[PDB]
Amino acid sequence: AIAQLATEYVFSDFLLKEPTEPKFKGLRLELAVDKMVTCIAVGLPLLLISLAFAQEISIGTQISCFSPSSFSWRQAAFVDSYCWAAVQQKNSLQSESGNLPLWLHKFFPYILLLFAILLYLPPLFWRFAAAPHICSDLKFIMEELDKVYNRAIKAAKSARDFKYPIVEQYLKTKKNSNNLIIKYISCRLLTLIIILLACIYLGYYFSLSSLSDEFVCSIKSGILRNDSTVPDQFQCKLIAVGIFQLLSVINLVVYVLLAPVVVYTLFVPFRQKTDVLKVYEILPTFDVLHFKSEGYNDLSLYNLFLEENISEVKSYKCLKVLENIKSSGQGIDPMLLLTNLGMI
Amino acid sequence: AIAQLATEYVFSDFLLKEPTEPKFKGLRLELAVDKMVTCIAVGLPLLLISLAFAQEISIGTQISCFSPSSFSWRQAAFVDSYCWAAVQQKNSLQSESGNLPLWLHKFFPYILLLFAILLYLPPLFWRFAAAPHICSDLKFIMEELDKVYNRAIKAAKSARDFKYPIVEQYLKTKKNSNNLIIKYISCRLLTLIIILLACIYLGYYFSLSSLSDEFVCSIKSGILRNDSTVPDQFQCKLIAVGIFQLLSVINLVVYVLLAPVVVYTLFVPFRQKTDVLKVYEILPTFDVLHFKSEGYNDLSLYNLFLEENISEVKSYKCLKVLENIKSSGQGIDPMLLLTNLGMI
Amino acid sequence: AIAQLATEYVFSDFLLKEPTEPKFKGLRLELAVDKMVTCIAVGLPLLLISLAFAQEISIGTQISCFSPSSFSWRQAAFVDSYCWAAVQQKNSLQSESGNLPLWLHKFFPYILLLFAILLYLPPLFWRFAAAPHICSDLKFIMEELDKVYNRAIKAAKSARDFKYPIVEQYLKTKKNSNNLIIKYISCRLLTLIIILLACIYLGYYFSLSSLSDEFVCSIKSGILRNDSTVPDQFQCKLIAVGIFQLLSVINLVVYVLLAPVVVYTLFVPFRQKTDVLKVYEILPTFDVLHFKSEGYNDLSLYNLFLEENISEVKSYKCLKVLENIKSSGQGIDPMLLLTNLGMI
Amino acid sequence: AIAQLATEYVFSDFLLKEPTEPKFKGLRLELAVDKMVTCIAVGLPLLLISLAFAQEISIGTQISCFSPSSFSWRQAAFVDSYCWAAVQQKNSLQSESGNLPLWLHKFFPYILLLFAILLYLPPLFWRFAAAPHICSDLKFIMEELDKVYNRAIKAAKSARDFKYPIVEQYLKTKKNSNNLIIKYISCRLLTLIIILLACIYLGYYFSLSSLSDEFVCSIKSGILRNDSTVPDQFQCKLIAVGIFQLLSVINLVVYVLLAPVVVYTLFVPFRQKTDVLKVYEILPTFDVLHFKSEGYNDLSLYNLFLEENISEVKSYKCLKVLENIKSSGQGIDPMLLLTNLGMI
């Protein structure tokens, strides 16, 4: 039913499932905006496919040819099925709009499924190629941040009663390499191109005259070519073509609204803001150097992933509340850190 | 069946599922009134869609055109399907009420699903954008309250046998920022606007003459335009239109009753009452300062979320019972706190 | 099938599911009588809806109009569907009993579902508004009782080898407030009113002549108004109306039997008997004062909830067996308590 | 399918599910004979309902009226559905056996479901009212028996290298109260009465002439009353009536065989034999006094429940093997108990 389809595709965790494995425990591995874009671009065409053939919206068979009254039920069924299979056969049918509109009307669900698959492909390539590496690197970075926070609080407590910036060096090295950012931009660009092509196709499909679904059909090949009792042609109409056009314009609207989001996603350096690591600069055990901005490198992408999935880090949360309290400046950062006692 | 739909949509945890993740363990992340509003506004139109096409209420096909007796079964089926697809084609049909009523009668389930999706969108935006931040902040606040309660009871026990207000400073800082409250008000306002538009549409749909479902249909395009055996027109009726109107007025009543709730929700500062933190003011380790009221800021929203999901805090429950006992004043707050022995 | 519906709605845990959350572990949060009343009042109309359209009891379509023999199958189907949709349209049909009986016959499942939803609403309001508070308070009370029992047995063992009545003070304070009892009485009263209205409706529906299901139908609007081959009217009958009346009288009987139960529930103070706390009065560490009776206050409701869900408390069970043994008076209460050794 | 129904209702744990809660861990809370009686009396009529309308045994529709050849398919369908709905309407039909046989033939599944529900009601009342109390009491009794066994074995080991009969006093007190036994006897008696009424009904249904399923039907009310082309009456037959009678006699046989079991159950004191507590009399720490027999009191019912669910007690099992070995008398009870070393 329509409501069942809605529950499956919008109100359920459709493509929102976290990786089912212990390797990525709590790691999104995909930005929220990218996940939203993929979920829409994939589950919208599927939802429209399901809707267009819902038991309520669908009168019945997808084509009716209006055989003569003399024709029996199965003769008329032969006519309808023959014309359905003959939309491909150009000789059999003669339609003013041509045969491409008939092909599109017959295979619209296939085309929507193709677009959905093509849009799901780049996210899958990301999740299967560049996701494990960033997952491992980000897990190491979070562990290093937790360890340095613990060491700093232990030092502060000892004072009240190595020291090498490994994480900073690793981030600096990431500043050079750009394979991950190149893959990310390539997959986003392919998604954008697929969306644009889908918009072109949907606009063309919705621009039809709405009468191209009606085509003339001739069961006059073979032994029936010279038969007399059979009329030379029939009036066939492809039902649900109006529904297809409505859903196609809906998908076109959604995709044109979505494309600016993908374009904004492509410009990762601009998105790289609100320095996540700036909060850690007040730790004595952490060097006061952010050095993450203004670069078409994997460093900006790592900064984005950190700003996305750093809320799970207790040390980061503690430092963030310390920073927020520092806005008033009533107290002192080391005193607040010592009082917090948030090692684990 | 009707009962199955009821069990799925009203008697089950439809959209009442808690976040399936360890990050939010026991945190609602959504006020009870907001959750009720979203659940109604989403699962009502879906329930009505399912009901309108239930196997019992539905006689059968959604349109019957009453072809002549001479017409065969599949000729009549062609007529019915053609008219169903031609509700869009204005030339084919001539109805007194126009063609918009026919469009609405055909696509009412789609319109209800659209309203449900549009009403579910703002809650989803909230849960995916502003929910993680408030979850982390509120978890930190609850942990700080538990820790300060434990410290105060330990101090009392030591007396019987830092001290910095970090949580108060954090709340004071939240008094300034307003991004969360702005997002909350924006999503509530969008929900209200969607509800009002849905009410307008449902009132228009229910105001129809009830005879607009009957339209005249002409299969007279193409080779059949000059055919003689076919009548110039047919009498088609869209079945289930009365059911659609009944369910639409039901949804209109529900939404007009719900809109005052959304308006009351918009006025969060008025809702900010029954100070949750007032109970903690009797703790020696906690400063006697509430400072949370009369502000279009995130502080009021945080106060609401606390008053919602603070019952899970053992320290808060203990302080609440101490406060309630203090109404008589027979005993002493520190003595009762020491006797309680409710560290964990 | 009928047996499947029975298993789902009477032999299964339909609305008998305990709260699926760790917050309420073993707490009913709903009295047994109230749960029985809600389960009946909700799952009876749903069961009757399912039964009335069971594949065995149902001959087939819900209306047959007996078109002339000259009419084709789909002409007759058009007639039947038109009349089904025209039960609303007063002009189309002319029935002796009127049009309200036809509306009721068509929408009886909707009306039963409406009554079920309206009866499920007050229980849901209770469980979502007043259940968390009573759950927290009752959990605290049980924990306090366990702790005082442990302290008393420890004192007795020490003798053989604070002391403040916090729980008693909390109960005394609850004696004043009445918001929970007011909500309980309001929800019970609304349930009673809904049940009475349902009884009125079912009595009216069952009082019909049983021939109102037969109505005269006229497909004579539009181009067919002046058509000659079509008869001026048809004889239509709404099938399953007898089944609807039978099930409606069954529901009426059940609801009239149930209403006295709801009225008895409304009088909570009378139900407040068999003092649960009287057993704890023999503990040296517990003050000898019950002070819970004869009040339209939340104290009586808390006493009811205690008498309901106190069997899970080992200390209460031990004190109950001590009390029962004290009926003979052969031994001594402190000696029996010491011998029991039931700390945990 | 038939085999699926069999698997669900006889070969599966239909109504044999243990209470899904930690409160009753391993406690039957229902005697084996009572559970068997309830399972049969409930799942037999449901199984017969399912069988009577199985896709294999069922030819098709439940009534066929044999309309004239001139009648079209949907005219005949109208006739059949009209007569199906008119079995209630006495004026419409004229049958030699009357109208009650037709009512019974139409609503036999409803009557079987009613009997199943009425037979399931007393067991449900028991499980929801008197089951928690007996569960708590019996758990306490088993814990006391385990503790006294442990104390006795510890004393024996100490000798080789309070003392109050709390459980005996509790059982003696149970000797007085009779509310549980009264409820048990009342529910068993109601089950017996329901079974007898079901037997009466099934005997009456099976005693029919087998031709009462054939009734004369007249679609001659309304505009068709004076119509000429329609015959004055039709020959309608209610299919599956023979299957209903066969299954009804099967159920009658099962229930008449079952009723003696219920009568034997009612006489609980006679069932109270094979003293379970007699084995514990050899323990030095346990007083040598059974005092459980010859009483219409809850003590006999508790003895039955003990004899039912005491096999789970390791101490009871050890004492039972000691008793069995004592039949030969080769050894000594205290020596065997010391050698067993079965504390836990």
Ligand SMILES: CC(C)CCC[C@@H](C)[C@H]1CC[C@H]2[C@@H]3CC=C4C[C@@H](O)CC[C@]4(C)[C@H]3CC[C@]12C
């Ligand atoms: C997904 C991508 C590939 C879709 C590409 C656009 C498709 C949908 C449409 C839009 C415009 C279309 C073209 C419009 C006009 C003509 C001229 C005609 O004589 C042959 C077909 C041809 C050449 C069409 C082929 C298909 C076409 C290119």
Ligand SMILES: CC(C)CCC[C@@H](C)[C@H]1CC[C@H]2[C@@H]3CC=C4C[C@@H](O)CC[C@]4(C)[C@H]3CC[C@]12C
């Ligand atoms: C992503 C955005 C830009 C998509 C917007 C949809 C645009 C591309 C659509 C809307 C209407 C469409 C046109 C409608 C009709 C025709 C005439 C046909 O003989 C050739 C294709 C052509 C010229 C279409 C090309 C694509 C088109 C211009």
Ligand SMILES: CC(C)CCC[C@@H](C)[C@H]1CC[C@H]2[C@@H]3CC=C4C[C@@H](O)CC[C@]4(C)[C@H]3CC[C@]12C
């Ligand atoms: C969800 C929102 C967009 C719904 C907006 C209201 C819709 C349902 C209805 C209510 C009143 C309607 C209008 C009423 C009157 C007219 C004048 C007519 O000559 C053209 C259509 C037009 C202009 C209608 C368009 C659709 C309309 C605006």
Ligand SMILES: CC(C)CCC[C@@H](C)[C@H]1CC[C@H]2[C@@H]3CC=C4C[C@@H](O)CC[C@]4(C)[C@H]3CC[C@]12C
């Ligand atoms: C949220 C609340 C205010 C909704 C209440 C429903 C209101 C808006 C509905 C109920 C009846 C409706 C009117 C019914 C009939 C017409 C005539 C038509 O030619 C234009 C629209 C118009 C004028 C409708 C406008 C909207 C309307 C006034």
Ligand SMILES: CC(C)CCC[C@@H](C)[C@H]1CC[C@H]2[C@@H]3CC=C4C[C@@H](O)CC[C@]4(C)[C@H]3CC[C@]12C
């Ligand atoms: C659930 C509640 C609202 C149901 C209320 C009772 C319903 C079922 C029935 C019972 C008696 C009925 C009334 C009986 C008589 C008349 C007089 C007639 O000229 C108009 C309808 C009217 C006024 C009926 C309206 C509907 C009615 C009130």
Ligand SMILES: CC(C)CCC[C@@H](C)[C@H]1CC[C@H]2[C@@H]3CC=C4C[C@@H](O)CC[C@]4(C)[C@H]3CC[C@]12C
């Ligand atoms: C909860 C209890 C009291 C419900 C008992 C059912 C009662 C209320 C039912 C049973 C028969 C019913 C009556 C049957 C017939 C008519 C005639 C009609 O023109 C007006 C309604 C009226 C007068 C009904 C009113 C309600 C009624 C009296």
Ligand SMILES: CC(C)CCC[C@@H](C)[C@H]1CC[C@H]2[C@@H]3CC=C4C[C@@H](O)CC[C@]4(C)[C@H]3CC[C@]12C
């Ligand atoms: C479950 C219980 C209520 C069933 C009771 C027995 C039912 C099945 C049957 C068995 C015998 C039957 C009775 C036999 C004879 C007559 C005399 C006739 O002129 C009216 C019906 C009446 C009075 C029957 C009513 C229904 C009846 C009582």
Ligand SMILES: CC(C)CCC[C@@H](C)[C@H]1CC[C@H]2[C@@H]3CC=C4C[C@@H](O)CC[C@]4(C)[C@H]3CC[C@]12C
């Ligand atoms: C539990 C045991 C005793 C049930 C045995 C079934 C008995 C009660 C059945 C079997 C045959 C039945 C009888 C068959 C026929 C008739 C004639 C009818 O006009 C009145 C009922 C009457 C007289 C039935 C009464 C009940 C009956 C005697």
Ligand SMILES: *[C@@H]1O[C@H](CO)[C@@H](O)[C@H](O)[C@H]1NC(C)=O
């Ligand atoms: C049909 O008859 C025509 C007559 O002109 C002939 O040319 C043609 O070959 C025939 N077709 C078949 C399939 O026999």
Ligand SMILES: *[C@@H]1O[C@H](CO)[C@@H](O)[C@H](O)[C@H]1NC(C)=O
């Ligand atoms: C139908 O016949 C008419 C006669 O006036 C002619 O004008 C029209 O073109 C014909 N239509 C078709 C589709 O051949």
Ligand SMILES: *[C@@H]1O[C@H](CO)[C@@H](O)[C@H](O)[C@H]1NC(C)=O
């Ligand atoms: C039907 O014919 C009658 C003849 O009196 C006329 O009044 C009426 O307008 C016609 N109806 C239609 C819909 O053409």
Ligand SMILES: *[C@@H]1O[C@H](CO)[C@@H](O)[C@H](O)[C@H]1NC(C)=O
């Ligand atoms: C049918 O015709 C008879 C002729 O005697 C008449 O008495 C009766 O009222 C008519 N019935 C209807 C429903 O018009």
